[model samples]
Target chain A: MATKAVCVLKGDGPVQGIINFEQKESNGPVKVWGSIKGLTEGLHGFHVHEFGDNTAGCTSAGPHFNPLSRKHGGPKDEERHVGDLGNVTADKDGVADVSIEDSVISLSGDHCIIGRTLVVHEKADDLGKGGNEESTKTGNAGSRLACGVIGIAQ
Target chain B: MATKAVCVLKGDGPVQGIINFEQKESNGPVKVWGSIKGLTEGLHGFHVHEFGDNTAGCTSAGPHFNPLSRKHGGPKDEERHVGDLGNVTADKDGVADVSIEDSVISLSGDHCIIGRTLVVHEKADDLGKGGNEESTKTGNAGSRLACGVIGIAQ
Candidate 1:
């Protein structure tokens, strides 16, 4: 049976969505897809944060999940962090259709992230090439707009 | 097989030691024991903080992990936090002979603290009874003295 998970995005206002994840094979890439609304019609950074606690909003959610303690980079970059998911772009209608597959993230075992968090930023991600000091750490992703905790699914 | 973990304590001082954790059986309590040197010869709070990152000392290690998001209490209190290991007493020689057993902490699974951090504070924990406003949050423990990230052991 395929393993699946979900995260219901939410924030202060005007931002919400449902993220779905499916892992059809153990040790294989996992499929991540979702639709989000209420953006500023441009690019926004997306990544899995370290902590699941959002008791105090995005500020307390912590940096990108870097279990391996590596530098931040694009999702497809070999040197990127495990939580790096690049970015998502919003259309003029403030809607974003997200679809991507990640190989390093897992839904099971030691490094599993069932209780982690997902965050959408207010600016585009630099993919760690901006060299602005903040780029490699957080892509200089600006402020956070929305976040949700990843939980297991039936 | 019995599972074990270790943490080599360190900080900006002579305060350092080795903490060992062992679980003799699956889903059983973990035995935590070690000797820490260089203290103030009194009671000091001990806990498992949330984050493992000590790159900026204990300040960056986040808070006492409250996955259940409950108020802080003593180690044996029913309403206590999982990270609450209570206080350790140091003799006039500034040495703490430590040995404890915890049922709530694990070396494996989601709540496993293998990658988290252990912290020793400068003051004794109030066990949430101090009505001075800082009790319920951090047991009114003063400041951090030493910290170390827990790691997997053979």
Candidate 2:
């Protein structure tokens, strides 16, 4: 069977939807797909947070699931968090039909992101090039708007 | 790395907690552990639903994820939905610290439940022996109080 997982976002904010990942095998690239609504008709930062524990709300979700302690960057960048998924773009109707693929993403690896939180951020990711320490760490994604835990999928 | 997944519930209901599954390998039994709060000091039904799509609330989550065309039963029952977890008991303080094990559950199989839903029901599961037709299908678990999609874990 193939490896798959998803995150269905829920929060006090307006953003909502599902992000899905699929891999043919343990070594294959993961196909990412989603349909997120209730955005600002622009780009939004998205990534897997460190914790599945939603203690005291999402603040306990910690930071990016960066097992390697790498700097943040786009999905294809070599120097990036394993959870660094770049940004998802929303259209005029405030909907982001997310479609991308990442070789580094995994459902069965050292940095796999199951039990983590998939967060949609308040701002677009600067792709780790915002020229500051925070930018390189989090891509300056800003506050998390809506999020859900990543779980094993069909 | 082992295959692990978690569900962190978020809903309009009182339930708040984490449910996690860990398999030492693809062929091993799943060790389940969780800590849920805000129950009524009794048993509550639990299972995986068919969809991660939270359309129009959780109503769109559909029925139990029964890929084998089996009737509902306990986690140890041979005649059971792959998602047919028996029940979790809550304490007087409204907390259910869940711990269980199942040899049949898998994170990489035809009936793997990633991208589906882990649901906490409003009633105790009848375990499919209640004699009614609904019991055979859903154990008459009543309404879904809260649920979250299962995703891959660290």
Candidate 3:
């Protein structure tokens, strides 16, 4: 009766990513893991954009999936973007082991996964790297590197 | 406006998986990419599962993300789950790179993602490893590795 799920992306490069459910609610704890190419080594902003628009390529995903009208800070930040789950740090190999729990995300009802969009930025996420000035929340992660439309794996 | 998407899993050992989107009105051309840990080199069946029940830590994601009324098989196959996107092969280092297009899935709509799940298997998918006899469309990848629930990133 545990709350867990997974998905696969098979093709050419690195294939990895996961979404863990804490309870059956939206504000549960979720962890994400995966690899990326053509990336910089450091911290980058990771979030779910308002729409899953891979149409325009990564650019279609648009904005930081933040519908809450918040900034780009970490989860701990009170005034952060709904999509602002925080920054994902890549290792020297440009790989990231992303894991975090969002108090605002759920798996049922309104906060479902179907229509949502997941996106990875280019630059580094200062975790407020700029301290609310130019960077606002997390120092602008950067451009859109990858995007996927959220849905039930099946 | 290409359909780009990726997936992953995390848990006990090294997390790995695959993903591909078929572009069509309903489960068409899907892009895919993936990597793995245990194996030295080879290809594995990567896909999406039916539910995301991570309540048991990260073990409830369950088998491949296959949700078709038929079973696990290939897209071309006449019978199988619509969730059966496809598979991916990995190199010595276990890194996959892919790009396909799925026509059925949408970025926004009824929000099918709100209550669904994702899963990663232990073995490689034969695309139709289950054989034509077995109703299961997917190749029966293996044991559940990592999993998660699809949530609105925004």
List lDDT for all candidates, in order.
0.79, 0.80, 0.50
Candidate 1, residues A42-106, lDDT tens digits: the string is: 98999888765554565656888888898999988998888898999889999989898998887
Q: How is the predicted docking of candidate 2 categorized under the CAPRI scheme?
A: acceptable
Q: For candidate 2, give the lDDT of residue A123.
A: 93
Share of native interface contacts recovered by each model: 0.00, 0.28, 0.29
lDDT (10s digit) by residue, model 3, range A1-154: 2243333321123423443334444456555554544445777677766654333444544566454666667668787766677777778876676667676655444443344566666676766657556477435676666655554432
Q: What digit string (tens of lDDT, one per residue) describes model 2 on residues B10-84?
A: 567888788888888787788889898988889899888876645444566678888888889998888999888
State model 3's lDDT.
0.50
DockQ of each: 0.03, 0.29, 0.15
**Model 1's chain B TM-score?**
0.96
For candidate 2, give the DockQ: 0.29
TM-score of chain A of 2: 0.95
Off-target runs (Cα >4 Å) in candidate 1 are A1-154
Residue A125, model 3, lDDT: 70
Instruction: Write one digit per residue (lDDT tens) for candidate 3, span B60-140.
Output: 445544334566666566655655656555567755554434433332333132324545555676667555543264476
Query: Poorest 10 consecutive residues of model 3 chain A by lDDT?
Result: A7-16
Better of 1 and 3 by DockQ: 3
